[PDB]
Design a protein around this nucleic acid. Structure first.
Lengths: 125, 47, 63
RNA sequence: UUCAAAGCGGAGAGGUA
């Protein structure tokens, strides 16, 4: 995915709050590079198969987390957000950003009663 | 949306009579006279 | 010029129409045309807003 | 001729209508 849809944000104290997609991409790339290196040296096959199984599990966790096997947890014991979690929920893209949005030239305040007004009139501060 | 003279209601006026009067005004006079009649009734009741 | 008179005129425009959604488009077209044709730097009765002017003109045309 | 330095994501708890 393009890098502005998974950006890096800086907290107040100078610490970074990176997304959850960057971790999953990093895991996939690291396992892929390690497996390619092992295949280059002509390693024993019983270890190459372990690497292949781990790579399958990594790509599966990137596509959808906790569907087939075990959920991948991050810093805390909370699950990471995969690609399917972006679109699927009630707080996903469809119901939160496309079927209703925030707008400009808008305000909000408390209401009181106004007599001596005509219907079709309102009082704006 | 005119020409229909109101009847002199010589009786007590609860909520049902007010709803009936508003309906009659809409049916006979239009949608801009009902607002005026409702505003006048609101002023009289508040007073 | 009063707001009540404008309300009555708009109600009269809604009737004699045969379609509620077709009169709003005509009023909008007339208002846009009037505001655009106002570009001549003479300021012909610029006090009135274009939509109210369109409503008044279309009501007058109704005879 | 150039703009420009103030905006950021998530989790938990409570409240008003």
């Amino acid at each position: 995915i393009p890098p502005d849809l998974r950006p890096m944000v800086q907290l107040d104290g100078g610490r970074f709050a990176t997304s959850d997609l960057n971790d999953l991409y990093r895991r996939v790339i690291n396992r892929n590079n390690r497996l390619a290196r092992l295949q280059e040296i002509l390693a024993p096959e019983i270890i190459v198969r372990n690497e292949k199984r781990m790579l399958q599990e990594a790509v599966d966790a990137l596509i959808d987390n906790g569907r087939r096997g075990r959920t991948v947890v991050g810093a805390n014991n909370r699950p990471l957000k995969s690609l399917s979690d972006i679109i699927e929920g009630k707080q996903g893209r469809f119901r939160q950003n496309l079927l209703g949005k925030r707008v400009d030239y808008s305000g909000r305040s408390v209401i009181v009663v106004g007599p001596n007004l005509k219907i079709h009139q309102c009082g704006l501060p | 949306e005119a020409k229909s003279a109101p009847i002199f209601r010589n009786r007590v006026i609860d909520k049902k009579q007010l709803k009936k009067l508003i309906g009659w005004t809409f049916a006979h006079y239009g949608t801009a006279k009902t607002a005026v009649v409702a505003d006048d009734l609101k002023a009289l009741g508040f007073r | 010029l009063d707001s009540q008179d404008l309300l009555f005129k708009a109600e009269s425009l809604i009737v004699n129409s045969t379609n509620r959604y077709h009169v709003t488009l005509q009023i909008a077209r007339r208002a846009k045309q009037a505001r655009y044709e106002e570009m001549e730097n003479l300021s012909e009765e610029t006090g009135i807003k274009p939509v109210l002017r369109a409503i008044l003109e279309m009501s007058d045309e109704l005879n």
